[PDB]
Structure 1
Amino acid sequence: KKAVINGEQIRSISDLHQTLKKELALPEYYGENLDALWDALTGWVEYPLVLEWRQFEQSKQLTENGAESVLQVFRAAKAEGADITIILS
């Protein structure tokens, strides 16, 4: 499974979760929060998974530390054993 995020288009943390919902084929009930993301990355999403995050810095702006908190859940999922490849470009 492949997921793409165009950072320069992320204007809010809300934008980020909805983009992920689409890109990761998350359930319609997706909670759009850090706990729901972890739950999706470890008990829903397909593997192997590749997350390509373009213009990460720019998205880091219009979301505060939100982008960083979301990224940390992905890295945390990887540490848990999930086959996720993160590209920060």
Structure 2
Amino acid sequence: KKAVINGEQIRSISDLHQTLKKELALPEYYGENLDALWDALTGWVEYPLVLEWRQFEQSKQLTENGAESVLQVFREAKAEGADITIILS
């Protein structure tokens, strides 16, 4: 329903997927990768969903293009029809 990401606390691409695993109540088998995220956002997660990504820039640093690629999946899922609200702060 509601998911929060505290950017300043993300040290790796791993921290991010695991933070998402918890914040979105993903399946234990969650693949912790872009494809697994997409499949979870469109065949598992509950809606409506509100994702609040704080300190995005900071988290972008310690993850390379990872954060941006994760954000992209959320954006496409939304364009796909998923009721997702993204708050980039």
Structure 2-normalised TM-score? 1.00
Shift of 1:45: 0.2
Q: Secondary structure at the match of 2:14?
A: helix
Shift of 1:18: 0.1
> What is the identity percentage for the equivalent residue pairs of Structure 1 and Structure 2?
99
Q: Which residue of 1 aligns with 2:36?
A: 36
Q: Any idea what the Cα deviations from partners look like across 1:32-64, whole Å, max 9, x if unmatched?
A: 000000000000000000000000000000000
Between the two proteins, the alignment pairs up a number of residues equal to 89
Shift of 1:12: 0.2
RMSD: 0.2
Note the residue ranges of structure 1 that are not aligned, 5 or more in a row: none
- Displaced runs of 4 or more, over 6 A: none
Note the residue ranges of structure 2 that are not aligned, 5 or more in a row: none
Structure 1-normalised TM-score? 1.00
